[PDB]
Design a protein around this ligand. Structure first.
Ligand SMILES: CCCCCCCCCCCCCCCCCC(=O)OC[C@H](COP(=O)([O-])OCC(O)COP(=O)([O-])OC[C@@H](COC(=O)CCCCCCCCCCCCCCCCC)OC(=O)CCCCCCCCCCCCCCCCC)OC(=O)CCCCCCCCCCCCCCCCC
Ligand SMILES: CCCCCCCCCCCCCCCCCC(=O)OC[C@H](COP(=O)([O-])OCC(O)COP(=O)([O-])OC[C@@H](COC(=O)CCCCCCCCCCCCCCCCC)OC(=O)CCCCCCCCCCCCCCCCC)OC(=O)CCCCCCCCCCCCCCCCC
Ligand SMILES: CCCCCCCCCCCCCCCCCC(=O)OC[C@H](COP(=O)([O-])OCC(O)COP(=O)([O-])OC[C@@H](COC(=O)CCCCCCCCCCCCCCCCC)OC(=O)CCCCCCCCCCCCCCCCC)OC(=O)CCCCCCCCCCCCCCCCC
Ligand SMILES: CCCCCCCCCCCCCCCCCC(=O)OC[C@H](COP(=O)([O-])OCC[N+](C)(C)C)OC(=O)CCCCCCCCCCCCCCCCC
Ligand SMILES: CCCCCCCC/C=C/CCCCCCCC(=O)OC[C@H](COP(=O)(O)OCCN)OC(=O)CCCCCCC/C=C/CCCCCCCC
Ligand SMILES: CCCCCCCC/C=C\CCCCCCCC(=O)OC[C@H](COP(=O)(O)OCCN)OC(=O)CCCCCCC/C=C\CCCCCCCC
Ligand SMILES: CCCCCCCC/C=C\CCCCCCCC(=O)OC[C@H](COP(=O)(O)OCCN)OC(=O)CCCCCCC/C=C\CCCCCCCC
Ligand SMILES: CCCCCCCCCCCCCCCC(=O)OC[C@H](COP(=O)(O)O)OC(=O)CCCCCCCCCCCCCCC
Ligand SMILES: CCCCCCCCCCCCCCCC(=O)OC[C@H](COP(=O)(O)O)OC(=O)CCCCCCCCCCCCCCC
Lengths: 93, 100, 141, 61, 75, 80, 62, 152, 62, 100
């Protein structure tokens, strides 16, 4: 009593539909976050941060000059061939 | 306008054949009692035990498998001379601090 | 239809075994004299009797199959025929739409998930300690 | 009813469009019909693989 | 006068002659319910084989009210 | 084949385009278009991708989630 | 096997019958140019191949 | 901003900048965009056939940009493809009965290198250059050339 | 033209040491997807080290 | 002791007690190549766990010889010593799940 003034078709259609949505997002958003469905720019998951924290761009090791590692103790060649030194046509700095 | 094949021949014989293949395979598995549970892992028991020790913290992280065997080949002896797990862990720790 | 068939999809010459249904039987009818009544004995064979243009229906079929090649307007076929004419074209176009708006989105999601969790979202996480993405079609494992 | 040159006036809106819009519409119409299609007409007529098979064959009397 | 749009007219019938084409009794015009039952079973087997991975390895222990020779003891 | 009637029951003409006035809603127009051009091509074209996608993505629950709680010899923790 | 085109041929319903075979036999045929001739050639083939008793032995073997 | 049109009309006008929508909603405009030789056969087309053709054509041309985007990403991926571990030479790996010469039966360039083994050929070309024999390729840094798809 | 334009460029580093790769698997194997511009710059510097032109080129900052 | 003890424990035991008989996993086929490769892999895994000197691993080599011709074993045993045998790479340095 005294709420009937509010109760109305438009006030009801936006109350059932809108409320149904309020629960659809409140219950689905955590699942999307867990399954990496949310956009990365909007938010990064903890799993995303854990993997990204392991990435760096300063490793300059492991350069080899052969297609195969044929075992042994010597390993693949690691020294640039003499005939290849100074064979690059690099534009002047 | 006269038809030679089934009106929906392409979908019929494509999806239909796939269905018969799948159903026949299930029947074959039942008759031979084949285990149907998919395992994506290797079954080397000693190895899986070493992996649990790493997950439990008994073996330090990023320790190579050749650092744990009782026989090493020549190439793994070469690697052991340059292996420093402690340094590797410190480097990873530094990266995490920088990221956060 | 794409493939040419002499009997049904004869577009090279446009030959049709029977006349149009629009024509009255008194004007033109399919060449079928299988129901001809027995010939009286006092009748005498004048023509060859050989199946050919001496028969009125066959003659009219040949004549029409040549004079039908010029017409004032198009004989609009119904929508059922038009759909069948380009059935493959339309189906391939819808296949392209499916590949862009159905296959595309979930394939992208799988790769992004793989980036973080090492394996696709539809695979069993391994514990063997091997590294890499692994299989993609899980039902063929 | 006023008839405009083909491809020059839109039927989607009562407003013909602004200067930039009109320039784009008019000039694309010109480019397609009198510049781009020069290549297609040249390939279709001057370099027909089927016309070349009948080159040097007498006329059909 | 009255006319019919040709695009919505019905397909013309085959001519009735000594050589008449008839597809009515073939039942090959479209996929039937049986085909869709095959698709449903395929989906079912696919889901079942994955959901219940111990079905192919059943238990030999059986009680069976009314013994083994009663009809409900075979399914 | 078997001669059959045209199954399109929608509106045969919207009238002359006059700046997009007196025309159906967009979704109604999309539905009428597919009715006019045939749903068989839509179902046929999308069927292959729908099947492949449903099977692959179904593994998210059938192969991954379920499996996490499938191994009967995993729930048991050691030293407990 | 009837010898008069007026006498119809019995056909079962299904995907391999006399009616099913008639619909497809002349699809690629340049010789079946009218109903009378088409039916004559159709019955000629049916008489020769399907009313031949020994032919059924090979059907079993295949 | 023009207020002489509705918002929907404005959007459709701009999508009609090339006249695509106008040709769809006007048969006369579509036939008068055909070159005269082919316009001769236009009167026979049904409206079903015309709009279906435009639909197939429009769907194709509107997906070409998407394929172009997918192809550019592919080129960038290949342009910066991550290094992979050097293959250990297993029991049945790198078996050779004779040198690789099927590409150059008489010249026999890079007999030891495989047909598309770019790093082996580069070092082999360097030997030939050091021997006063010119060979083409493998000299410009990737980031200093156009169309490399390896620039930051 | 595709072939010629590619042949001029130095070869990309297809392979690295087997051991060093697995000691930094995550960075190398996944670096591209997480940040492609920095991964591209890192690759360029490695090419400059593998072919001995590092002191002759200035690699643009990312 | 039990009559079915051989089948119990492993399928491997059957040929371990009867070295010159068919292995249950390969008796259906005359070609025994796959049998040789399994036996060699088992010798490789034994040494990693127990060492070369262990009598068990020495017998796992005798079992491998029973089905593997000498020319194959010598080649595969050299690859193993170098560290290039694909049947002996430690599991954490395998590439089978990478790039696909
Ligand atoms: C593995 C790799 C597989 C690769 C497949 C490659 C397919 C390439 C062609 C695809 C294509 O364009 O097909 C659409 C197109 C559809 O035809 P349509 O006339 O528009 O169809 C209208 C309706 O579909 C309704 O049509 P309809 O049912 O009324 O019938 C008309 C149509 C019906 O047919 C088709 O439409 C064919 C569709 C094939 C799809 C394949 C996928 O007829 C034909 O087109 C007949 C073509 C000639 C067939 C000749 C067969 C020769 C071999 C026979 C066996 C000999 C050995 C026997 C040994 C054993 C003895 C006991 O097919 C063709 O026109 C191509 C026909 C020739 C294909 C030859 C392929 C090799 C055999
Ligand atoms: C509360 C709920 C809780 C959950 C409950 C879950 C319950 C299960 C849910 C799943 C659903 C189960 C459904 C069961 C019953 C289904 C009944 C049904 O409707 O099926 C029929 C339905 C459609 O069949 P239809 O009725 O015969 O089609 C009607 C047509 O409209 C008839 O018209 P039409 O035949 O005239 O059609 C047009 C036709 C017209 O065509 C012609 O005229 C004939 C032409 C033939 C010759 C063609 C020539 C060659 C092609 C030339 C063009 C090439 C273009 C492309 C080039 C590509 C280049 C790379 O054109 C075509 O179709 C072909 C041409 C179009 C382009 C083809 C493109 C290539 C295709 C081949 C490759 C396909 C694989 C691609 C893979 C990816 C890429 C590698 O099929 C399916 O739905 C598929 C099977 C479904 C059942 C199995 C599902 C298994 C997995 C279920 C997992 C679900 C999740 C479980 C979760 C559990 C959690 C606990
Ligand atoms: C073979 C070319 C393949 C190119 C693939 C490229 C892929 C990437 C996306 C391209 C998107 C455009 C559409 C491509 C699909 C095909 C279009 C088509 O069929 O045109 C037919 C159209 C007329 O054909 P028609 O046979 O005479 O008539 C057929 C129909 O009856 C009547 O046709 P309609 O009137 O119904 O038109 C169909 C409609 C269907 O297309 C669409 O509606 C698709 C909309 C996609 C939107 C994507 C966003 O297409 C158009 O409206 C095309 C308009 C093209 C206007 C070009 C005017 C000249 C531009 C010159 C630019 C110069 C830049 C210099 C920069 C210098 C910097 C220093 O053809 C042309 O006008 C020729 C050009 C075709 C398009 C070329 C696109 C090249 C894009 C280059 C971008 C460069 C960016 C540089 C940035 C630099 C930053 C620093
Ligand atoms: C995101 C990456 C991809 C981006 C690129 C995507 C490329 C594909 C884009 C295709 C657009 C095609 C436009 C056609 C031209 C329309 C012209 C027009 O205004 O028409 C007005 C006309 C006006 O109607 P009318 O006047 O023609 O009416 C004809 C006469 N009667 C009334 C008898 C029917 O109506 C239409 O719009 C008709 C065309 C509707 C076509 C709808 C096609 C949808 C394509 C996308 C599929 C999405 C699938 C998603 C997954 C589904 C899973 C099941
Ligand atoms: C009251 C009822 C309300 C109902 C509302 C329903 C809303 C439904 C919304 C669905 C949104 C779906 C979004 C999908 C986004 C996918 C983006 C994506 O992956 O883009 C990249 C991807 C390709 O990526 P690559 O880098 O090449 O990697 C994969 C191949 N190697 O591109 C594509 O897949 C292109 C296609 C994008 C399709 C986007 C689909 C959007 C659908 C919106 C539907 C809205 C419905 C609203 C209904 C309202 C009813 C009242
Ligand atoms: C390959 C050989 C195929 C032979 C069988 C098919 C021949 C065929 O149809 O060719 C003709 C056909 C169309 O000619 P019409 O005048 O319409 O028909 C001929 C008379 N009715 O021609 C073509 O297919 C055009 C060929 C053009 C490209 C030729 C390229 C040759 C490449 C050789 C590489 C070595
Ligand atoms: C006509 C066909 C022309 C084919 C020309 C291209 C041939 C080609 O690319 O062959 C190389 C390709 C890939 O081999 P690798 O270079 O070792 O792969 C290493 C990848 N970095 O395959 C071959 O070598 C086989 C070539 C067979 C002969 C091809 C010409 C006929
Ligand atoms: C060369 C290789 C080709 C590809 C592989 C071929 C595989 C074999 C051939 C398959 C061809 C199928 C084509 C499609 C035909 C089609 O859809 O055919 C469709 C028909 C129905 O015809 P309609 O469309 O007219 O209804 O399907 C049926 O007849 C079955 C109806 C549904 C039955 C449901 C229950 C089935 C139970 C099965 C139990 C099996 C137990 C087995 C124990 C050992
Ligand atoms: C080219 C012309 C071809 C003509 C057709 C040739 C068909 C030949 C079939 C011969 C079959 C004989 C063996 C039967 C199985 C047997 O004894 O097999 C013996 C075994 C074991 O019997 P016991 O254990 O009791 O000793 O039987 C079974 O375990 C069950 C057998 C079921 C057989 C069903 C499948 C075959 C059905 C055949 C129907 C048509 C028969 C026609 C006969 C002329």
């Amino acid at each position: 009593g005294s709420i009937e003034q509010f109760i109305n078709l438009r006030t009801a259609r936006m109350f059932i539909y809108g409320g149904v949505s309020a629960v659809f997002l409140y219950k689905a958003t955590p699942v999307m976050y867990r399954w990496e469905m949310l956009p990365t720019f909007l938010v990064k998951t903890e799993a995303y941060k854990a993997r990204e924290a392991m990435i760096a761009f300063d490793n300059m090791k492991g350069i080899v000059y052969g297609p195969y590692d044929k075992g042994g103790l010597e390993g693949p060649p690691t020294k640039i061939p003499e005939t290849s030194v100074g064979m690059m046509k690099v534009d002047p700095m | 306008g006269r038809r030679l094949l089934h009106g929906n021949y392409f979908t019929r014989y494509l999806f239909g054949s796939l269905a018969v293949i799948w159903i026949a395979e299930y029947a074959a598995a039942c008759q031979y009692g084949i285990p149907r549970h998919r395992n994506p892992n290797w079954m080397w028991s000693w190895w899986l035990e070493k992996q649990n020790q790493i997950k439990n913290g008994e073996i330090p992280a990023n320790t190579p498998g050749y650092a744990m065997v009782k026989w090493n080949n020549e190439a793994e002896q070469r690697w052991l001379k340059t292996l420093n797990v402690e340094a590797m862990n410190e480097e990873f720790a530094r990266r995490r601090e920088a990221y956060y | 239809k794409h493939f040419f068939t002499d009997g049904a999809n004869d577009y090279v010459t446009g030959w049709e075994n029977t006349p149009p249904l629009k024509f009255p039987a008194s004007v033109m009818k399919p060449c079928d004299y299988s129901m001809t009544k027995p010939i009286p004995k006092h009748w005498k064979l004048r023509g060859s009797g050989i199946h050919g243009p001496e028969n009125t229906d066959l003659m009219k079929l040949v004549l029409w199959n040549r004079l039908k090649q010029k017409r004032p307007q198009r004989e609009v076929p119904n929508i059922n025929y038009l759909k069948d004419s380009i059935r493959l074209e339309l189906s391939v176009n819808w296949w392209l739409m499916s590949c862009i708006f159905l296959w595309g989105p979930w394939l992208h999601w799988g790769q992004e998930y793989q980036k973080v969790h090492e394996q696709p979202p539809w695979a069993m996480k391994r514990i063997d300690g091997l590294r890499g993405e692994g299989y993609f079609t899980w039902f063929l494992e | 009813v006023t008839r405009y040159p083909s491809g020059t006036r839109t039927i989607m809106s009562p407003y013909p469009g602004g200067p930039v819009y009109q320039w784009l519409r008019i000039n694309y119409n010109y480019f397609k019909r009198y510049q781009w299609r020069r290549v297609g007409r040249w390939q279709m007529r001057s370099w027909c693989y089927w016309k070349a098979a009948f080159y040097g064959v007498p006329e059909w009397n | 006068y009255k006319t019919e749009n040709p695009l919505y007219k019905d397909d013309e019938p085959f001519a009735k002659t000594c050589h008449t084409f008839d597809y009515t009794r073939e039942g090959t015009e479209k996929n039937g319910l049986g085909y869709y039952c095959l698709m449903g079973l395929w989906a079912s087997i696919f889901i079942w084989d994955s959901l219940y991975t111990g079905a192919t390895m059943p238990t030999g222990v059986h009680r069976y009210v009314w013994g083994p020779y009663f009809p409900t003891a075979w399914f | 084949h078997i001669p059959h009637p045209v199954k399109y029951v929608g509106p045969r003409r919207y009238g002359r385009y006059v700046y997009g006035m007196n025309r159906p809603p967009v979704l109604r127009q999309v539905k009428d278009w597919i009715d006019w051009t045939g749903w068989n091509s839509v179902f046929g074209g999308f069927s292959f991708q729908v099947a492949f996608g449903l099977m692959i993505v179904s593994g998210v629950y059938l192969n991954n989630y379920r499996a996490t709680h499938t191994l009967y010899y995993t729930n048991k923790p050691d030293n407990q | 096997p009837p010898t008069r085109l007026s006498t119809p041929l019995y056909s079962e319903g299904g995907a391999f019958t006399v009616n099913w075979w008639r619909n497809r036999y002349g699809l690629y045929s340049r010789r079946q140019t009218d109903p009378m001739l088409a039916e004559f050639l159709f019955r000629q083939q049916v008489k020769e191949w399907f009313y031949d008793v020994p032919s059924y032995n090979y059907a079993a073997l295949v | 901003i023009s207020t002489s049109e509705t918002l929907n009309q404005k959007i459709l006008r701009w999508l009609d900048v090339t006249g695509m929508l106008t040709r769809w909603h006007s048969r006369r405009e579509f036939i008068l965009d055909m070159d005269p030789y082919f316009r001769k056969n236009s009167g026979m087309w049904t409206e079903w056939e015309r709009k279906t053709l435009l639909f197939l054509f429009y769907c194709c041309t509107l997906a070409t940009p998407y394929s172009a985007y997918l192809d550019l990403q592919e080129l960038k991926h290949q342009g910066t493809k991550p290094p992979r571990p050097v293959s250990l030479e297993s029991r049945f790996m790198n078996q050779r009965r004779y040198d690789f010469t099927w590409m150059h039966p008489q010249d026999k360039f890079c007999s030891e290198c495989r047909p598309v083994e770019l790093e082996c050929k580069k070092m082999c070309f360097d030997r030939y250059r050091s021997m006063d024999y010119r060979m083409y390729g493998f000299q410009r840094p990737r980031i200093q050339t156009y169309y490399s798809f390896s620039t930051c | 033209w595709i072939y010629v334009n590619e042949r001029q460029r130095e070869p990309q580093e297809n392979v690295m040491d087997h051991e060093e790769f697995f000691r930094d698997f995550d960075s190398i194997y996944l670096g591209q997807v997480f940040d492609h511009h920095r991964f591209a710059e890192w690759l360029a510097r490695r090419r400059a080290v593998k072919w001995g032109y590092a002191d002759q080129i200035h690699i643009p900052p990312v | 002791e039990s009559a079915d003890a051989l089948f119990v424990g492993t399928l491997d035991r059957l040929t371990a007690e009867h070295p010159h008989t068919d292995d249950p996993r390969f008796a259906f086929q005359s070609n025994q190549w796959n049998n040789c490769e399994l036996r060699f892999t088992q010798f490789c895994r034994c040494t990693r766990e127990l060492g070369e000197d262990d009598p068990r691993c020495k017998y796992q080599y005798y079992r491998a010889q029973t089905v593997c011709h000498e020319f194959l074993l010598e080649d595969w045993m050299e690859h193993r010593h170098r560290g290039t045998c694909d049947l002996d790479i430690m599991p954490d340095r395998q590439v089978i799940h990478m790039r696909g």
